[PDB]
Nucleic acid binder design. Structure first.
Ligand SMILES: [Zn+2]
Ligand SMILES: [Zn+2]
Length: 205
DNA sequence: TGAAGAGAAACCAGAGTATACCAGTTACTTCTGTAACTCAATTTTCGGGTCCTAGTACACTGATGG
């Protein structure tokens, strides 16, 4: 919605990089899940025609654009004259952009999404008229879902690297086939591996 | 009065002789690099598409059988 703050769209973009759980759970897979990456790395920024609207709303937020502006303040790199902003003092109605031109939305460190303002139109009477739901999803992609590599009946909850049982190197397992292949009777890892929790992108996105 | 050689008119291979190639080398040039601006021609390379054939997921259908 025009005249609707930025960070009203940043908080709406469903990306699975917000739901990834950190750390490795090989020794014991019953650990209290570390906070999803939505909570740990709260920083993000839009880039709209030479101005990094940074999400400095929270204290855990740090300037992701500082890296780029420093990297460009060095040796000339094509780019030049980068700006900054705060993304809570801005609405889409205050923004000076091109249509159909790719801009940036970086979040979770370097999960980059290419933003394209396809068109701008005055609101009609036959579309949604609310605001409580308006940065709303017109279309999404319906990605594929990874499955457990042992039995192809359930989706992958775990991804293991350097597994001394897996044929493939990154091997995805459901919970059942993971518990059954790597753990003797009480949680002592059998063999060697690095198991991480796997958020299926084709499910939470 | 034959004998042991004397003379005579044929072939026959071979040793110089005659060619017959077949290399063996002296000058005498161009062609490098660097520099520069010019302009057009040509190549390279380089990130990304592009089309195509072949599976793949996934919700639904359509029986099927116990
Ligand atoms: Zn993302
Ligand atoms: Zn499984």
């Amino acid at each position: 919605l025009g005249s609707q703050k930025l960070t009203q769209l940043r908080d709406s973009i469903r990306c699975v990089s917000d739901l990834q759980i950190g750390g490795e759970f090989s020794n014991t897979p019953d650990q209290a899940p570390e906070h999803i990456s939505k909570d740990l790395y709260k920083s993000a920024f839009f880039y709209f025609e030479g101005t990094f609207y940074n999400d400095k709303r929270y204290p855990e937020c740090r300037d992701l654009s500082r890296t780029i502006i420093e990297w460009s303040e060095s040796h000339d790199r094509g780019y030049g004259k980068f700006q900054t902003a705060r993304m809570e003092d801005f609405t889409f109605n205050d923004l000076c952009i091109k249509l159909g031109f790719p801009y940036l939305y970086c979040h979770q460190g370097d999960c980059e999404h290419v933003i394209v303002i396809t068109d701008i139109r005055l609101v009609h009477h036959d579309d949604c008229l609310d605001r409580t739901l308006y940065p709303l999803l017109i279309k999404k992609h319906w990605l594929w879902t990874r499955k457990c590599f042992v039995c192809k009946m359930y989706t992958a909850r775990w991804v293991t690297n350097n597994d001394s049982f897996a044929p493939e190197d990154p091997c995805f397992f459901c919970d059942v086939c993971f518990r059954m292949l790597h753990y003797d009777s009480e949680g002592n890892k059998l063999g060697e591996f690095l198991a991480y929790p796997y958020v299926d992108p084709g499910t939470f996105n």
